[PDB]
Amino acid sequence: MILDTDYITEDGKPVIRIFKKENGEFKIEYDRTFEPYFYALLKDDSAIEEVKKITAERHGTVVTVKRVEKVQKKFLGRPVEVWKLYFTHPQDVPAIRDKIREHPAVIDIYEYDIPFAKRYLIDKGLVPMEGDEELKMLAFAIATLYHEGEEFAEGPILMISYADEEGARVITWKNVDLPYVDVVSTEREMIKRFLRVVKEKDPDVLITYNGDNFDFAYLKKRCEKLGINFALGRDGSEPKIQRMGDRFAVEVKGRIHFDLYPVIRRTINLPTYTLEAVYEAVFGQPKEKVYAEEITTAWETGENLERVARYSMEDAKVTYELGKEFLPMEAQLSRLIGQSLWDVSRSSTGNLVEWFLLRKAYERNELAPNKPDEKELARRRQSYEGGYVKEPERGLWENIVYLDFRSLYPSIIITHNVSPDTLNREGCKEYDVAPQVGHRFCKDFPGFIPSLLGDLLEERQKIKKKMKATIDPIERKLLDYRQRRIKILASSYYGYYGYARARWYCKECAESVTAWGREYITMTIKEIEEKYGFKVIYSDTDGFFATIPGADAETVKKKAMEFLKYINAKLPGALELEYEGFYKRGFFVTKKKYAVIDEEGKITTGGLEIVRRDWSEIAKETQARVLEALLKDGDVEKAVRIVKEVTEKLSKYEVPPEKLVIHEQITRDLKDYKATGPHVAVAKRLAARGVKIRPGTVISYIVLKGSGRIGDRAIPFDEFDPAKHKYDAEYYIENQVLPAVERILRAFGYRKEDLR
DNA sequence: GTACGCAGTTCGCG
DNA sequence: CGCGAACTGCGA
């Protein structure tokens, strides 16, 4: 099983290292034969003699083109002639590529920003994370001494906890009477013992929760301050801190540093992403938080260090448990994308699609388009029309079916062969024509993306079959993870077409896909109303709710089935409308806001405050209980009484302040805000106290009693002192609970004033 | 990764 | 000094 690749330099030459786990043994394979390269498109072949002479400078050393070769390739499916330019070292390419591109005989250059070790995995056809190999994992976490207004890692690490299958332990340099605590004499001795623990356990994976931006950078700054060779790598190297975007990332050679934080952010939508919140959300068990101030107090007074050590131990333990849950998933993603787990677990959706496409392009001798430069990026900022949203027939409805298309956009892409290499391609004998926008797509050969998308959907169907028949539960689970990742990838192509930084960006493809989608959904709506007497209540992009006014439940279900058989004989190719469910009652608030209940009593909602992080729990729980009284009990009067009891508890300050927390993430640098709201005002006061605030930080605040701007009265919740602070009961009644429920109950004649 | 949509905060204008 | 526009977050 391949775990990772990198390269080192030997006498000026790159040597690829393939880190492997085969039959339980860590192994490094070395490859000295791989040459870095990129491509140049020339105005005339004779010009290669001049291009060959171009030089540049690296670390004082002259950079030259090593060797050149004319190759034939395809660009968007058309033959093209380019020159492959070879170099001695991969660091030669960034040094020289601009001077070559700028040459007057060079039209353009291609595949010039592909990192050498990832180039290697593609060109050799190697796939990471294949095989039945069991990886050894170890989570760890640190606890530190913090003083307000200090510089990063000015204070010592107090505890290092670690956990694996055999349990969890805490190393610390004060005496703590717990059986899982190992006591050492100093911070230095604690770090050194932790190093020895890692070396002795020799894990394949190190699991952290936010180790990329806290724990490893803290350990490095302490190791520097203390003069410790932080030799975590299997080659004896120290952890490598890399800048990645607005943030950092930490790699450990010969291991995989698995930081759960970016994995969870792009996998689960949660109100906050504290370790405690993620743990409870995933396993349903509570984890108590101990705050820095309590840690510092406990360390400085020596009082109650057992609480701190238990917190530290639980940190490592739940980090291990979350690692066990999420690593096999990401490992299947790594295998599907064909790049290392380290890279893939940290990569955005668009980047994941692009690396998969780069590999498929290589396999098909297709030269890759470049990422856009600044000019082209500005060219690509125009938008296009999206999905169809019908204005709902607002109110309460009965006996509702929901019908939707199976993977509408992937089905359109495959059926109509929507791809940049088929778009308006001349000389074909069959075309499909996008409605409204008019773009033509040739059908004479599978387009690059349709062909890949069809293979993905097919393989996903084969995997589900093998799952049902396999007796190995491990294989079945890993197959499950793979088929789920394939589905996600399949559903990512449409958005990637519209992604202005995409190599294979194609606005014409994107808007053809949404144009066909609008046509298919509005055609279906028109047919079910005109030929089957349904009334469509609401529709958004790829499905609709409908009923037959005055018909009983079984008539609506039967007639819906008859309509499906009718309509699906009219839909071409992969398009398929399906019966998604039957709902006894549904309430439609506005576009994108509804709630329905099935015949078993389960309520599902779209777009309602109940799922939003920026609405307080008191409002969300009140909305949930109202929806229960209406859809499940038909008891409007009960729902009204519920809102009144809630507002009465807020008025008497009887609601627990925990239910009053609002969460809103910071989306940009604090400097770039044109307007300041509550969460921005709270972020700025925190940052004014030294607190790191980056895009993606979730501000969790509560609104206190007073007047003026809400922003002026908002404090972070973990500063809420129930004696020094009184929350704004009128705000939570008037701006949170009542708005969330008024838009529902007004359909029955009530206004806000009747709900207090 | 995309477009479409609601709606709460804040501010400024007339 | 009510009303709307800008800004903002997050919801197929």
Nearest nucleotide to A611, CA against C1' atoms: C11
Q: Is the CB of A664 under 7 A from strand C?
A: yes
What is the C-alpha to C-alpha distance for residues A129 and A343, in angstroms, rounded to an integer?
Answer: 13
In terms of DSSP bridges, do strands A603-606 and A431-433 run parallel, antiparallel, or are they unpaired? unpaired
Name, in order, each residue with C-beta under 8 angstroms of A406's C-beta and a sequence gap of 6 or more.
A574, A576, A577, A578
User: Three-state DSSP class for A643?
Assistant: helix
What is the C-alpha to C-alpha distance for residues A163 and A313, in angstroms, rounded to an integer?
Answer: 8
Nearest nucleotide to A714, CA against C1' atoms: B9
CA/C1' separation A674–C8 (Å): 10
User: Three-state DSSP class for A610?
Assistant: helix
CATH of A2-124, one of 3.30.70.330, 3.30.342.10, 2.60.120.620, 3.40.50.300: 3.30.342.10
What is the C-alpha to C-alpha distance for residues A431 and A445, in angstroms, rounded to an integer?
Answer: 11
Name, in order, each residue with C-beta under 8 angstroms of A210's C-beta and a sequence gap of 6 or more.
A259, A260, A261, A275
Q: What angle do CA A734, A736, A737 make, to 5 degrees?
A: 80
CA/C1' separation A387–B1 (Å): 15
Q: At what angle do helices A292-301 and A305-337 cross, to 10 degrees?
A: 140
Count of helices and strands (H, E) across chain A:
24, 28
What is the C-alpha to C-alpha distance for residues A230 and A191, in angstroms, rounded to an integer?
Answer: 8
CA/C1' separation A508–B5 (Å): 24
The residue whose CA lies nearest the C1' of nucleotide C9 is A664
Nearest nucleotide to A592, CA against C1' atoms: B5
Q: Is the CB of A674 under 7 A from strand C?
A: yes
Distance between alpha carbon A428 and the CA centroid of its chain, in Å? 40
The first and second tokens of residue A597, run together, are 């209940």
Listed resolution, Å: 2.1
Chain C bases near protein Cβ (<7 Å): 6-12
The residue whose CA lies nearest the C1' of nucleotide C11 is A607
At A644, which helix (H) or strand (E)?
Answer: helix A636-651
CA/C1' separation A608–B8 (Å): 14
CA/C1' separation A708–C1 (Å): 15
Q: Is the CB of A666 under 7 A from strand C?
A: yes
Q: What is the CATH number of domain A137-345?
A: 3.30.420.10
3-state secondary structure A176-197: CCCCCEEECCCHHHHHHHHHHH
CA/C1' separation A644–C2 (Å): 29
CA/C1' separation A487–B1 (Å): 15
In contact, A744 and A627? CB cutoff 8 Å: yes
Question: What phi and psi, each to the nearest 5 degrees, are found at residue A269?
Answer: -90, 110
Q: Which of residues 384-403 of A touch strand C (CB under 7 A)?
A: 387
Q: What method was applied to determine this entry?
A: X-ray
Question: What phi and psi, each to the nearest 5 degrees, are found at residue A738?
Answer: -60, -45
Tell me the DSSP string of A129-166: T-SSPPPPEEEEEEEE---TTPPTT-SPEEEEEEEETT
Give the domain A603-754 fold. Answer: Topoisomerase I; Chain A, domain 4 (1.10.132)
Distances (CA, A) of A110 to A63, A84, A95, A366, A698: 19, 9, 15, 11, 40
Tell me the DSSP string of A495-539: HHHT-TT-TT--HHHHHHHHHHHHHHHHHHHHHHHHHH--EEEEE
The first and second tokens of residue A415, run together, are 């059926």
Q: Is the CB of A747 under 7 A from strand B?
A: no
What is the C-alpha to C-alpha distance for residues A379 and A373, in angstroms, rounded to an integer?
Answer: 10
In contact, A696 and A670? CB cutoff 8 Å: no
Name, in order, each residue with C-beta under 8 angstroms of A531's C-beta and a sequence gap of 6 or more.
A563, A566
Closest CA to A281 of A239, A325, A245: A325
Is residue A534 classed exposed, middle or buried when 0-12, 13-18 and 19+ CB atoms within 10 A define those classes?
buried
- How many other CB atoms are there within 10 angstroms of residue A420's CB atom? 21
What sign for the dihedral angle of Cα A394, A396, A399, A404?
positive
What is the C-alpha to C-alpha distance for residues A451 and A467, in angstroms, rounded to an integer?
Answer: 24
